[PDB]
Design a protein around this motif. Structure first.
Motif, PDB file in Angstrom:
ATOM      1  N   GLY A  75       0.840  -1.185   0.000  1.00  0.00           N
ATOM      2  CA  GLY A  75       0.000   0.000   0.000  1.00  0.00           C
ATOM      3  C   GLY A  75       0.874   1.233   0.000  1.00  0.00           C
ATOM      4  N   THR A  76       0.223   2.396   0.079  1.00  0.00           N
ATOM      5  CA  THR A  76       0.897   3.670  -0.123  1.00  0.00           C
ATOM      6  C   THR A  76       0.919   4.494   1.148  1.00  0.00           C
ATOM      7  OG1 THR A  76      -1.116   4.781  -0.750  1.00  0.00           O
ATOM      8  CG2 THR A  76       0.092   3.604  -2.487  1.00  0.00           C
ATOM      9  N   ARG A  77       0.529   3.882   2.275  1.00  0.00           N
ATOM     10  CA  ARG A  77       0.354   4.529   3.557  1.00  0.00           C
ATOM     11  C   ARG A  77      -0.666   5.652   3.408  1.00  0.00           C
ATOM     12  NH1 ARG A  77       2.588   2.382   7.969  1.00  0.00           N
ATOM     13  NH2 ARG A  77       4.453   1.088   7.714  1.00  0.00           N
ATOM     14  N   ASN A  78      -0.275   6.891   3.587  1.00  0.00           N
ATOM     15  CA  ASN A  78      -1.269   7.953   3.498  1.00  0.00           C
ATOM     16  C   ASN A  78      -1.232   8.692   2.165  1.00  0.00           C
ATOM     17  OD1 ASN A  78      -2.071   7.640   6.389  1.00  0.00           O
ATOM     18  ND2 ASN A  78      -0.022   8.499   6.813  1.00  0.00           N
ATOM     19  N   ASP A  79      -0.403   8.268   1.221  1.00  0.00           N
ATOM     20  CA  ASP A  79      -0.116   9.032   0.009  1.00  0.00           C
ATOM     21  C   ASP A  79      -1.149   8.678  -1.049  1.00  0.00           C
ATOM     22  OD1 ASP A  79       0.971  10.397  -2.166  1.00  0.00           O
ATOM     23  OD2 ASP A  79       2.970   9.536  -2.035  1.00  0.00           O
ATOM     24  N   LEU A  80      -1.834   9.690  -1.571  1.00  0.00           N
ATOM     25  CA  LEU A  80      -2.866   9.511  -2.586  1.00  0.00           C
ATOM     26  C   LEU A  80      -2.380   9.821  -4.000  1.00  0.00           C
ATOM     27  CD1 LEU A  80      -5.994  10.983  -0.708  1.00  0.00           C
ATOM     28  CD2 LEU A  80      -5.359   8.608  -1.105  1.00  0.00           C
ATOM     29  N   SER A  81      -1.083  10.105  -4.178  1.00  0.00           N
ATOM     30  CA  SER A  81      -0.504  10.423  -5.484  1.00  0.00           C
ATOM     31  C   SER A  81      -0.634   9.261  -6.487  1.00  0.00           C
ATOM     32  CB  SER A  81       0.991  10.748  -5.351  1.00  0.00           C
ATOM     33  OG  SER A  81       1.255  11.694  -4.329  1.00  0.00           O
ATOM     34  N   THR A 109      -6.415  -5.765  -2.626  1.00  0.00           N
ATOM     35  CA  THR A 109      -6.562  -4.559  -3.431  1.00  0.00           C
ATOM     36  C   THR A 109      -7.649  -3.717  -2.749  1.00  0.00           C
ATOM     37  OG1 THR A 109      -7.995  -5.701  -5.020  1.00  0.00           O
ATOM     38  CG2 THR A 109      -5.637  -5.458  -5.586  1.00  0.00           C
ATOM     39  N   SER A 110      -8.887  -3.774  -3.224  1.00  0.00           N
ATOM     40  CA  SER A 110      -9.920  -2.902  -2.709  1.00  0.00           C
ATOM     41  C   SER A 110     -11.269  -3.221  -3.347  1.00  0.00           C
ATOM     42  CB  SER A 110      -9.529  -1.452  -2.950  1.00  0.00           C
ATOM     43  OG  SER A 110     -10.667  -0.670  -2.945  1.00  0.00           O
ATOM     44  N   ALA A 111     -12.323  -3.048  -2.551  1.00  0.00           N
ATOM     45  CA  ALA A 111     -13.678  -3.236  -3.046  1.00  0.00           C
ATOM     46  C   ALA A 111     -14.069  -2.238  -4.132  1.00  0.00           C
ATOM     47  CB  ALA A 111     -14.686  -3.169  -1.909  1.00  0.00           C
ATOM     48  N   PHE A 112     -13.388  -1.098  -4.257  1.00  0.00           N
ATOM     49  CA  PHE A 112     -13.690  -0.259  -5.418  1.00  0.00           C
ATOM     50  C   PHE A 112     -13.560  -1.012  -6.748  1.00  0.00           C
ATOM     51  CE2 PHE A 112     -12.443   3.579  -2.684  1.00  0.00           C
ATOM     52  CZ  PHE A 112     -13.758   3.883  -2.396  1.00  0.00           C
ATOM     53  N   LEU A 113     -12.771  -2.091  -6.807  1.00  0.00           N
ATOM     54  CA  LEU A 113     -12.757  -2.874  -8.038  1.00  0.00           C
ATOM     55  C   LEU A 113     -14.092  -3.552  -8.314  1.00  0.00           C
ATOM     56  CD1 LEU A 113      -9.875  -2.148  -7.720  1.00  0.00           C
ATOM     57  CD2 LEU A 113      -9.179  -4.456  -8.312  1.00  0.00           C
ATOM     58  N   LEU A 114     -15.000  -3.590  -7.332  1.00  0.00           N
ATOM     59  CA  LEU A 114     -16.326  -4.158  -7.503  1.00  0.00           C
ATOM     60  C   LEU A 114     -17.406  -3.087  -7.571  1.00  0.00           C
ATOM     61  CD1 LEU A 114     -15.857  -6.867  -4.739  1.00  0.00           C
ATOM     62  CD2 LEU A 114     -15.840  -7.316  -7.213  1.00  0.00           C
ATOM     63  N   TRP A 115     -17.023  -1.825  -7.542  1.00  0.00           N
ATOM     64  CA  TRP A 115     -17.978  -0.722  -7.587  1.00  0.00           C
ATOM     65  C   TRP A 115     -18.211  -0.265  -9.023  1.00  0.00           C
ATOM     66  CZ3 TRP A 115     -18.352   3.917  -3.742  1.00  0.00           C
ATOM     67  CH2 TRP A 115     -18.543   3.470  -2.438  1.00  0.00           C
ATOM     68  N   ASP A 116     -19.386   0.301  -9.260  1.00  0.00           N
ATOM     69  CA  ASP A 116     -19.629   1.121 -10.430  1.00  0.00           C
ATOM     70  C   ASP A 116     -18.539   2.181 -10.555  1.00  0.00           C
ATOM     71  OD1 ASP A 116     -20.607   3.040 -12.260  1.00  0.00           O
ATOM     72  OD2 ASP A 116     -22.613   3.114 -11.379  1.00  0.00           O
ATOM     73  N   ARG A 123     -10.978  11.474  -5.355  1.00  0.00           N
ATOM     74  CA  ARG A 123      -9.752  11.664  -4.570  1.00  0.00           C
ATOM     75  C   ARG A 123      -8.995  10.353  -4.426  1.00  0.00           C
ATOM     76  NH1 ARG A 123      -8.569  16.012  -1.692  1.00  0.00           N
ATOM     77  NH2 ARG A 123      -9.626  16.783  -3.575  1.00  0.00           N
ATOM     78  N   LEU A 124      -9.705   9.238  -4.478  1.00  0.00           N
ATOM     79  CA  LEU A 124      -9.100   7.915  -4.332  1.00  0.00           C
ATOM     80  C   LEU A 124      -8.801   7.236  -5.659  1.00  0.00           C
ATOM     81  CD1 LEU A 124     -11.183   6.625  -1.273  1.00  0.00           C
ATOM     82  CD2 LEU A 124      -9.090   8.011  -1.315  1.00  0.00           C
ATOM     83  N   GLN A 125      -9.040   7.909  -6.783  1.00  0.00           N
ATOM     84  CA  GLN A 125      -8.923   7.223  -8.066  1.00  0.00           C
ATOM     85  C   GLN A 125      -7.481   6.883  -8.399  1.00  0.00           C
ATOM     86  OE1 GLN A 125     -11.792   6.497 -10.382  1.00  0.00           O
ATOM     87  NE2 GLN A 125     -10.191   4.930 -10.499  1.00  0.00           N
ATOM     88  N   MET A 149     -10.709  -7.941  -1.604  1.00  0.00           N
ATOM     89  CA  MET A 149     -11.176  -6.610  -2.009  1.00  0.00           C
ATOM     90  C   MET A 149     -12.003  -6.026  -0.873  1.00  0.00           C
ATOM     91  SD  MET A 149     -12.103  -7.226  -6.081  1.00  0.00           S
ATOM     92  CE  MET A 149     -10.860  -7.884  -7.174  1.00  0.00           C
ATOM     93  N   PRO A 150     -11.347  -5.455   0.148  1.00  0.00           N
ATOM     94  CA  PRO A 150     -12.063  -4.987   1.342  1.00  0.00           C
ATOM     95  C   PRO A 150     -12.651  -3.612   1.113  1.00  0.00           C
ATOM     96  CG  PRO A 150      -9.714  -4.612   1.589  1.00  0.00           C
ATOM     97  CD  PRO A 150      -9.880  -5.322   0.285  1.00  0.00           C
ATOM     98  N   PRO A 151     -13.749  -3.307   1.794  1.00  0.00           N
ATOM     99  CA  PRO A 151     -14.195  -1.912   1.896  1.00  0.00           C
ATOM    100  C   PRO A 151     -13.319  -1.167   2.885  1.00  0.00           C
ATOM    101  CG  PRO A 151     -15.566  -3.187   3.307  1.00  0.00           C
ATOM    102  CD  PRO A 151     -14.512  -4.175   2.717  1.00  0.00           C
ATOM    103  N   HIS A 152     -13.868  -0.198   3.607  1.00  0.00           N
ATOM    104  CA  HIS A 152     -13.045   0.597   4.558  1.00  0.00           C
ATOM    105  C   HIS A 152     -12.386  -0.287   5.621  1.00  0.00           C
ATOM    106  CE1 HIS A 152     -11.562   3.852   6.974  1.00  0.00           C
ATOM    107  NE2 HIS A 152     -12.227   3.396   8.032  1.00  0.00           N
ATOM    108  N   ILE A 153     -11.089  -0.092   5.851  1.00  0.00           N
ATOM    109  CA  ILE A 153     -10.362  -0.840   6.872  1.00  0.00           C
ATOM    110  C   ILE A 153     -10.395  -0.034   8.172  1.00  0.00           C
ATOM    111  CG2 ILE A 153      -8.112  -1.700   7.561  1.00  0.00           C
ATOM    112  CD1 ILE A 153      -7.575  -2.168   4.506  1.00  0.00           C
ATOM    113  N   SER A 172     -21.877  -4.965   4.493  1.00  0.00           N
ATOM    114  CA  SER A 172     -21.286  -3.929   5.338  1.00  0.00           C
ATOM    115  C   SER A 172     -20.144  -3.277   4.576  1.00  0.00           C
ATOM    116  CB  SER A 172     -20.778  -4.513   6.662  1.00  0.00           C
ATOM    117  OG  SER A 172     -19.899  -3.623   7.352  1.00  0.00           O
ATOM    118  N   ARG A 173     -19.781  -2.046   4.984  1.00  0.00           N
ATOM    119  CA  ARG A 173     -18.774  -1.271   4.267  1.00  0.00           C
ATOM    120  C   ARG A 173     -17.521  -1.025   5.097  1.00  0.00           C
ATOM    121  NH1 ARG A 173     -21.649   3.702   1.330  1.00  0.00           N
ATOM    122  NH2 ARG A 173     -19.469   4.007   0.714  1.00  0.00           N
ATOM    123  N   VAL A 174     -17.358  -1.759   6.201  1.00  0.00           N
ATOM    124  CA  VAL A 174     -16.146  -1.724   7.004  1.00  0.00           C
ATOM    125  C   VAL A 174     -15.698  -3.152   7.280  1.00  0.00           C
ATOM    126  CG1 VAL A 174     -17.430  -1.581   9.188  1.00  0.00           C
ATOM    127  CG2 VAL A 174     -15.062  -0.834   9.097  1.00  0.00           C
TER     128      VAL A 174
END
Ligand SMILES: NC(=O)c1ccc[n+]([C@@H]2O[C@H](COP(=O)([O-])OP(=O)(O)OC[C@H]3O[C@@H](n4cnc5c(N)ncnc54)[C@H](OP(=O)(O)O)[C@@H]3O)[C@@H](O)[C@H]2O)c1
Ligand SMILES: CCc1c(-c2ccccc2)nn2c(=O)cc(-c3cccc(C(=O)O)c3)[nH]c12
Length: 204
Positions: A75-81, A109-116, A123-125, A149-153, A172-174
């Motif tokens: 992961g990228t820790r707190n970096d959104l770049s 990875t992340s549940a966004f891979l399962l989102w529309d 900001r998270l793209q 592919m988790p939602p919010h950790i 659930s989303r957490v």
């Protein structure tokens, strides 16, 4: 059964509790870390430490050698770049697994891979884009790949009571970091999630 594992990202939020639970469970754990100073100095600790970068194929090769399975919590820790660290790391990890005959990889990875895609927060793209690239690398690898592919950790306690939803979004989303790590390790004990997407979630 699986006994020797490599964990990438063992010093991160989820990594650290996954490392702890793995050592508690009796796994022989190897970690690749960028600085040994970021590992715990007491408590459950890994049997083997490699200090280096997932971007260095030689460092990844040393870590994957001799293992039965691999956990990826990069992961990228707190970096959104914008970034390619996770997808390039994954190319190296796959290459090493094939060179050494390691066939099982459980990767976050992340549940966004399962989102529309019109619903992913802009900001998270940038991070999500490399999660997509990393998933593609692992999907195409031919390895036994569990896509987690988790939602919010969150920072809620370990429960072991979360729901696992396959190839879709769950109720659930957490998911707490401890339960996410717990689930990562559960995926080493079974092949029934291989080739599927997995959404752990729970209500705390
Ligand atoms: N936060 C959320 O709610 C959420 C939701 C869904 C998905 N996710 C995804 O879940 C995954 C894990 O989340 P997390 O918060 O537990 O990760 P994290 O706290 O950011 O930990 C990231 C790990 O990656 C390692 N790393 C980064 N670059 C590296 C490199 N070049 N070489 C070697 N190691 C490197 C870091 O090592 P260092 O200690 O040296 O920095 C650290 O151990 C991430 O991909 C995150 O995007 C997060
Ligand atoms: C893209 C990763 C990420 C990060 C992050 C943090 C630090 C640095 C870089 C990224 N924070 N972060 C969140 O707070 C929530 C989610 C998430 C994912 C999927 C579904 C849902 C949901 O609401 O259902 C929420 N992802 C996420």
């Amino acid at each position: 059964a699986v006994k020797k594992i490599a964990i990438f990202g063992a010093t991160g939020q989820t990594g650290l509790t996954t490392l702890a639970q793995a050592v508690q469970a009796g796994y022989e754990v190897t970690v690749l870390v960028r600085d040994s100073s970021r590992l715990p100095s007491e408590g459950p600790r890994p049997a083997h430490v490699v200090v280096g970068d997932v971007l260095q194929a030689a460092d990844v090769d040393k870590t994957v050698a001799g293992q039965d399975a691999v956990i990826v919590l990069l992961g990228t820790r707190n970096d959104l770049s914008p970034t390619t660290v996770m997808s390039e790391g994954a190319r190296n990890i796959v290459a090493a697994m094939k060179a050494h005959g390691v066939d099982k990889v459980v990767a976050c990875t992340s549940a966004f891979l399962l989102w529309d895609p019109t619903k992913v927060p802009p900001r998270l793209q940038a991070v999500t884009d490399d999660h997509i690239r990393m998933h593609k690398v692992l999907r195409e690898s031919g390895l036994k790949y569990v896509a987690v592919m988790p939602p919010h950790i969150g920072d809620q306690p370990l429960t072991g009571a979360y729901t696992v939803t396959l190839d879709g979004r769950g109720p659930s989303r957490v998911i707490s970091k401890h339960d996410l790590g717990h689930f990562m390790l559960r995926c080493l004990t079974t092949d029934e999630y291989d080739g599927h997407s997995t959404y752990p979630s729970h209500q705390y």
